[PDB]
Design a binder for this molecule. Structure first.
Ligand code: HEM
Length: 154
């Protein structure tokens, strides 16, 4: 489950590009999530009204939340294999106030991978893709562990 130093290095190489625009990457991640899995838009009372891609792109509220999402994920990724303190409140919030099944966390992992590949073809080769995939698997798995403790079957 754990990543090597070299795998983390690949993850943070591509994250270095994302960092220079957390809101804009985050917006594309949410859009690709919602369009690839429309059922996930149901979890977001604030965005359910957005019925088109162009509407989603014009939503400053959607853009802002994309920054929140990727800011939180960046802090986690930057902690590499010692992210217990950053991940725990996130798990807590997504197992209580917004009950997000692990399946949808897989969907957004998939959306993140697709956005990075579309926006960063050169820096996101097969090895960096495999490493980012692994980091997001570790992330979901660790969230799932906390879910169990919190009483939520994900
Ligand atoms: C990489 C995975 C994710 C990250 C890093 C993330 C991060 C966040 C953060 C930081 C917040 C606000 C603070 C908090 O609640 O702790 C939030 C809120 C929320 N999250 Fe997530 N999230 C992720 C995945 C998801 C998914 C897949 C869904 C639904 C399918 C979801 C649904 C929500 C909702 C509904 C809120 C509240 C929105 C609002 O403030 O109105 N999250 N998320």
């Amino acid at each position: 489950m754990g990543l090597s130093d070299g795998e983390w290095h690949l993850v943070l190489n591509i994250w270095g590009k994302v960092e220079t625009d957390l809101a804009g990457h985050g917006q594309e991640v949410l859009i690709r999530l919602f369009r690839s899995h429309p059922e996930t838009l149901e979890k977001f009372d604030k965005f359910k009204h957005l019925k088109s891609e162009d509407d989603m792109r014009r939503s400053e509220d959607l853009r802002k939340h994309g920054n929140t999402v990727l800011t939180a994920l960046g802090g986690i990724l930057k902690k590499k294999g010692h992210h217990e303190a950053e991940l725990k409140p996130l798990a807590q919030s997504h197992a209580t106030k917004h009950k997000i099944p692990i399946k949808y966390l897989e969907f957004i992992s998939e959306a993140i991978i697709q956005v990075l590949h579309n926006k960063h073809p050169g820096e996101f080769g097969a090895d960096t893709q495999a490493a980012m995939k692994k980091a997001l698997e570790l992330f979901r798995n660790d969230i799932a562990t906390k879910y169990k403790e919190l009483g939520f079957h994900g």
